[PDB]
Design a protein around this ligand. Sequence first.
Ligand SMILES: Cc1cc2nc3c(=O)[nH]c(=O)nc-3n(C[C@H](O)[C@H](O)[C@H](O)COP(=O)(O)OP(=O)(O)OC[C@H]3O[C@@H](n4cnc5c(N)ncnc54)[C@H](O)[C@@H]3O)c2cc1C
Ligand SMILES: Cc1cc2nc3c(=O)[nH]c(=O)nc-3n(C[C@H](O)[C@H](O)[C@H](O)COP(=O)(O)OP(=O)(O)OC[C@H]3O[C@@H](n4cnc5c(N)ncnc54)[C@H](O)[C@@H]3O)c2cc1C
Ligand SMILES: Cc1onc(-c2ccccc2)c1C(=O)Nc1ncc([N+](=O)[O-])s1
Ligand SMILES: Cc1onc(-c2ccccc2)c1C(=O)Nc1ncc([N+](=O)[O-])s1
Lengths: 272, 272
Amino acid sequence: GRRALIVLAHSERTSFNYAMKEAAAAALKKKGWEVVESDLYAMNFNPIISRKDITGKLKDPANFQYPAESVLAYKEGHLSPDIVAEQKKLEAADLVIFQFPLQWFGVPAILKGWFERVFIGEFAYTYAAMYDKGPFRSKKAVLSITTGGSGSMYSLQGIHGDMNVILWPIQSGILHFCGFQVLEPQLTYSIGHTPADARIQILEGWKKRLENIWDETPLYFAPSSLFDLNFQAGFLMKKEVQDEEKNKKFGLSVGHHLGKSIPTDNQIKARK
Amino acid sequence: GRRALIVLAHSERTSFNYAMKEAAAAALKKKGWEVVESDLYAMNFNPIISRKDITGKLKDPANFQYPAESVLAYKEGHLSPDIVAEQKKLEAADLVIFQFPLQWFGVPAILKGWFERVFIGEFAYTYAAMYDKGPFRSKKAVLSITTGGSGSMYSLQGIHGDMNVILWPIQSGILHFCGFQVLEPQLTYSIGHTPADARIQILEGWKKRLENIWDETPLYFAPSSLFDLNFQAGFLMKKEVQDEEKNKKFGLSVGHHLGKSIPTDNQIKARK
Ligand SMILES: Cc1cc2nc3c(=O)[nH]c(=O)nc-3n(C[C@H](O)[C@H](O)[C@H](O)COP(=O)(O)OP(=O)(O)OC[C@H]3O[C@@H](n4cnc5c(N)ncnc54)[C@H](O)[C@@H]3O)c2cc1C
Ligand SMILES: Cc1cc2nc3c(=O)[nH]c(=O)nc-3n(C[C@H](O)[C@H](O)[C@H](O)COP(=O)(O)OP(=O)(O)OC[C@H]3O[C@@H](n4cnc5c(N)ncnc54)[C@H](O)[C@@H]3O)c2cc1C
Ligand SMILES: Cc1onc(-c2ccccc2)c1C(=O)Nc1ncc([N+](=O)[O-])s1
Ligand SMILES: Cc1onc(-c2ccccc2)c1C(=O)Nc1ncc([N+](=O)[O-])s1
């Protein structure tokens, strides 16, 4: 791997998030990487999917259906140029870093809208190649999140609940849906209550970690081969896998907890 | 109850989501509700938080920080008028219906931004009044979600994983965190793959449910009294509560699964 894309979702250049992006860019560059940036607020990026993402006539403007229409525009080269420029940043990149503050327990609206406008069907997924088969299966993505709350509020017994459940919709439903290998999220908690000397260390540990990031082991998701990938089956786990798993104590995943215990830190720690 | 707010996040009046919003409005109006709409697309609602949300002079424009500044603005009456207009709608509402298509395993960006810009500190939550003590604790919220994928994809063995995990960050982290009593979601699956007759039954089903919605039992979240709500303890579950829970087979909820089995449909079905 030699190209990295840094997507940043923060309005302030005075912010620690911005500093985390700057630190990632410096470390990667110093290590031989090409780094490309998507500073969404600085790009004044438009996060609202609409029929203006299609450049030209619509297949059915009286019954406008965004996924069908946008897939068709992608095949025919009729996507709004600001989408196309992002899709090509993705195409080029080996590594993708998402640097954002956690907002209402997910990504800022500006970055959520980035997924909805840029991760177009066919380009970012098809139903014939989902999850570990996805188009991005050669790429690696990592979430670098800062929070207001403290680590303990998001421990199994913290008031907010398991961070691993909060991460699941993003890391499995978005990134890994499209084929990304997801690395362990960089989680920096209670950043607005961290003394100056700690913030400095946080930025050093981030830069240190990027020195070898491409070698890391990604999170575990259940492989798509465990499932009957057709409607007649329901995209349910294969009968013989269900059987094999009745014995087992743990679910496979946050999402595939199977009513049993969730493997510890499934969405936070790769398998040691 | 008397007053309903319906927030819709869909660009097309021809969509089933729009029909769901029309149905909800008629059903509640016929039973004597006042009903107000926030059709985000028709409003062309700005979904990006920024310094522009604070009309007038900032407290520290040299280090803009949105939580403190927006809260100050709220207390001093300097929130941008569109924000303020939606906070008014919310104050008057007893019931809030969120009608949206599921997009990348959460809410459309336009609704994510609506939360971010409208659920301001002090207005929508305090350090001192989180979750079941929250400012909206007299109000009831419900999610009305449509999906492309089908129900079995989101069952415990569906390839997508437990829908209960997907709902957690929204229903607990956003609605309940502000004090809402969260009612069972209205989950209409594979709506693009549903014949017209079923479609009409879903609309009628939804209207029939809305005839007694206020009398429904809300979803279960761990009460905040089970937690030491202070930084000294880290907002960890109280000692006596952990002990007493060590002998229980199920966790309390999706977020507080405490490494055990998650109680079935904790986020989809109220407790019997
Ligand atoms: C709408 C909204 C929703 C939110 N929802 C949640 C939620 O669900 N959960 C949650 O936990 N939090 C939530 N938050 C809080 C949010 O996660 C934090 O405010 C955010 O993570 C802080 O990031 P920041 O970089 O802006 O911090 P900043 O305050 O911008 O930066 C932190 C400190 O680092 C300093 N700094 C800046 N640059 C550098 C540098 N180069 N080197 C060293 N120090 C530097 C700054 O001066 C500052 O003192 C929410 C906030 C908003 C606005
Ligand atoms: C960016 C994006 C991301 C997405 N992510 C996901 C995801 O993560 N998971 C997922 O499951 N899905 C996802 N989807 C799919 C999405 O959930 C569905 O495509 C959407 O719910 C379709 O609903 P609709 O309101 O647009 O109905 P339409 O697709 O517009 O139409 C549905 C049917 O309802 C009929 N109808 C309309 N009005 C009425 C009426 N009044 N009475 C009777 N019939 C009527 C229409 O004739 C049509 O046959 C995504 C879609 C997009 C664009
Ligand atoms: C600190 C801090 O910074 N941002 C947030 C936040 C803002 C919006 C949504 C979610 C989190 C936050 C915080 O979590 N305060 C409270 N949560 C647990 C506490 N309690 O139990 O009382 S105090
Ligand atoms: C149908 C349908 O409609 N919208 C979506 C969707 C679009 C973006 C993100 C998530 C869902 C969708 C769908 O999920 N098809 C796949 N589900 C499991 C399948 N598999 O395992 O192969 S095929």
